């Protein structure tokens, strides 16, 4: 294939062992070097594993690979939180004649479930000259991913307008973050007084709920 | 019991020993 | 240890050729050693193109293969990217990489990566609002502030935060396209004795439109 075969994810808490895999057709990697690939958002892929089952220096014994000739497998033991990335195999496909990556297997860190911190904020007066109005809510620091935000303008729930974009997990806490944008005409915003951010997550049947009123 | 080709060329199947 | 940073356009218009140059530092060319480029698309996986060893020897992506070219400088210390005929389908981040080939194919180091968009957009400067809390919110130990970035094109921009404390409780949302423009926000928490008592200013760099923009964030 001119892709390798990886789940989509894996998910493990701190102090256990993950295995991902990465698989061809038949026994295409039998005589091919498998490498390893450790991608945290934001940077370049890292070197982890070469030659099927090699460490370079620097990288501690708890990573492992192996290669079956069908399939080769990446061991994550004693997972730590900075272990949080995407993770791709390559090896060459002598088939194809071309190097050939794995589709990737993300890697959550569990963690305890925790609230988001939630903050309002009216847009700002600059903002307004535009013609445009955008609310903004920041939901910083809430663990699982899974959340629901609803905005409501004096009390009354919009839909239309609303733009959600989230972080990927914390190295340091394995937390997300969230920022949830409403946005409006500056015209239709100066018509209403209450705006208003809920955020239902697992941590409580109640939402958190953040407001601000115009006047 | 796997090894290299006995680096100038990409490709080169692996070995048995 | 080697050092590989690449250079080159952010925004390369469809039908015309992409070139990046990738500097290699501080190893020998002349080792046998290959020297190569990868690509991943926003939010995909990890893309081989090609690489090159100093005797000439090249190898290429199939599809690819017509419209690549990839080339070696030693003297230079430089690696080179000629991608025709660009298409949209090329917006992609680029790393160059170092190859250990024959049958061993392993890749070390990698450059830090260069973000090339593909696009018939123009170049637009971002506008950055301060984000401050609304008159009479109820004040915890810390407080959290912000900055919305509108309207920019192409990616990407950088937001750093200056303040009295230091905080480095900072997030950072990723950019969202609508209508050809990018808008993304950040956030910083700080504690509550030292803002609006001290200055909080965001930063927010884009090199595209050579643009640099700070807003101070002031109490309502």
């Known amino acids: 294939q001119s892709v390798w075969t990886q789940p989509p994810s894996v998910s493990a808490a701190p102090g256990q062992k993950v295995t991902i895999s990465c698989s061809g057709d038949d026994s295409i990697l039998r005589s091919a070097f ?12 890292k070197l982890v594993i070469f030659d099927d089952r090699q460490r370079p220096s620097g990288i501690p014994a708890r990573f492992s690979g192996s290669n079956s000739g069908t399939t080769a497998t990446l061991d994550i033991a004693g997972l730590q939180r900075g272990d949080e990335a995407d993770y791709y195999c390559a090896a060459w496909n002598g088939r194809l004649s071309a190097f050939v990556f794995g589709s990737g297997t993300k890697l959550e860190i569990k963690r305890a479930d925790a609230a988001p911190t939630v903050s309002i904020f009216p847009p700002s007066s600059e903002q307004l000259t535009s013609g445009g109005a955008s609310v903004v809510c920041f939901l910083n620091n809430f663990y699982p991913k899974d959340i629901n935000v609803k905005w409501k303008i004096d009390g009354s729930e919009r839909q239309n307008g609303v733009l959600n974009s989230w972080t990927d997990q914390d190295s340091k806490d394995s937390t997300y973050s969230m920022s949830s944008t409403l946005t409006l005409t500056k015209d239709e915003y100066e018509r209403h007084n209450s705006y208003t951010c809920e955020a239902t997550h697992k941590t409580s049947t109640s939402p958190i709920v953040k407001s601000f009123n115009r006047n | 019991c796997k090894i290299h080709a006995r ?3 990409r490709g080169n199947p692996t070995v048995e020993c | 240890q080697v050092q590989l940073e690449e250079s080159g356009p952010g925004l390369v218009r469809p039908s015309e050729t992409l070139s990046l140059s990738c500097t290699v530092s501080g190893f020998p060319m002349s080792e046998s050693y290959f020297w190569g480029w990868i690509r991943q698309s ?5 893309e081989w193109l090609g690489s090159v060893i100093h005797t000439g020897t ?4 199939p599809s690819l293969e017509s419209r690549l070219t990839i080339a070696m400088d030693p003297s230079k210390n430089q690696v080179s990217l000629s991608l025709t005929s660009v298409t949209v389908a090329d917006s992609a981040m680029y790393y160059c990489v170092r190859i250990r080939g024959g049958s061993s194919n392993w890749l070390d180091p990698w450059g830090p990566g260069i973000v090339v968009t593909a696009s018939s957009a123009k170049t637009t400067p971002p506008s950055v609002y301060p984000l401050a ?5 109820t004040t915890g130990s810390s407080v959290t502030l912000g900055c919305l970035v509108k309207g920019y094109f192409p990616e990407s921009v950088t937001v750093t935060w200056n303040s009295g404390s230091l905080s480095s409780s ?7 396209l609508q209508s050809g423009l990018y808008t993304m926000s950040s956030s910083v928490t700080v504690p509550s004795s030292t803002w609006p008592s001290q200055t909080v200013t965001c930063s927010v760099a884009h090199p595209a439109s050579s643009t640099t923009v700070d807003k101070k964030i002031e109490p309502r």
């Open chain 1, 34 to 45: 498998v490498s390893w690939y450790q991608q945290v958002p934001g940077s370049a892929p």
């Open chain 2, 7 to 9: 680096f100038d060329s």
């Open chain 3, 42 to 46: 926003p939010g995909k996986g990890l």
């Open chain 3, 58 to 61: 090249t190898y290429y992506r």
């Open chain 3, 133 to 137: 809390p609304g008159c009479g919110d």
């Open chain 3, 170 to 176: 900072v997030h950072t949302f990723p950019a969202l």
